[PDB]
């Protein structure tokens, strides 16, 4: 059972130096191809532009993109997905001056460069095949 | 030296179940009568109404109040202020359905009952005689 509802839409204010810390557990085993998605939305409205979408295909790869004027830009990917089958994970997204740094269980896996300033992000949505224990926003 | 600037004005969205976790250190010894203040503001504008003001007189007492239509209401106080002279403290404010619960270094010291809904709080300001290490907002 999830501590928070999923999809989880969290109003936020982000600045350089912020960290979003998401703790949860996949609800399906990896042979069932579960996913996790995190969106940095510019408004509560889910059709608003997205500064950074992060979609993990557990045991497979992560696909990242951004949506500008309603148009998806060029996808970025990495095969580095150090999540453990069936276990709680800790996903940290650090807002640096040039990029979002993504850490999985303390392991840096990617840096997604800002194409709009991160202070334009007003909502973080956590969605798909996870039970959500906690979400924190720290400075 | 402070990790964050003081006064620290943090835009927030709070709901029942939120926790504001403030870590920092008094910048004066207790014989010099330092203070710490935390405000739950309804807007970024510091003349907006205040759902909950928390002002610690270290080694002495805490005074709490709220400001409604620009008018300060009746002060509430407790003498329970378990902060240590010269040390880092952890101040947690939990948003429950009926009250803000205030914890100092894990110790519950007070419950300040809501007179407006906590979701009306849009800014948290941390101010006065502290160096601020971190501020987190968790759900």
Author numbering:
A (entry chain A), B (entry chain A): 1 to 139
Sentences from the paper on this structure:
Galectin-13 (Gal-13, a.k.a. placental protein 13 or PP13) was first isolated from human placenta, and its gene has been mapped to chromosome 19q13.1, which is in close proximity to the galectin-4, -7, -10 and 1412 genes. As with all other galectins, Gal-13 adopts the typical “jelly-roll” fold formed by sandwiching two anti-parallel β-sheets that consist of six (S1-S6) and five (F1-F5) β-strands and a short α-helix connecting strands S2 and F5. Gal-13 crystallizes as a dimer with its subunit interface formed by the last five C-terminal residues (Val135, Cys136, Val137, Cys138, and Asn139) that are located within the F1 β-strand.
We crystallized wild-type Gal-13 and its R53H mutant using two different conditions. Our Gal-13 structure shows that Arg53 protrudes from the base of the carbohydrate binding site, and the characteristics of an arginine, including its size and charge, are obviously different from those of a histidine. Even with 50 mM lactose in the crystallization buffer, our Gal-13 structure lacks any electron density that is expected for a bound lactose molecule and only shows water molecules in the ligand binding site. However, our research shows that galactose, maltose, xylose, arabinose, glucose, mannose, lactose, fructose, sucrose, and cellulose do not inhibit Gal-13-mediated agglutination. Moreover, our biochemical results indicate that Gal-13 may not bind carbohydrates, a proposal that is consistent with previous work demonstrating that Gal-13 purified from human term placenta contains no carbohydrate at all.
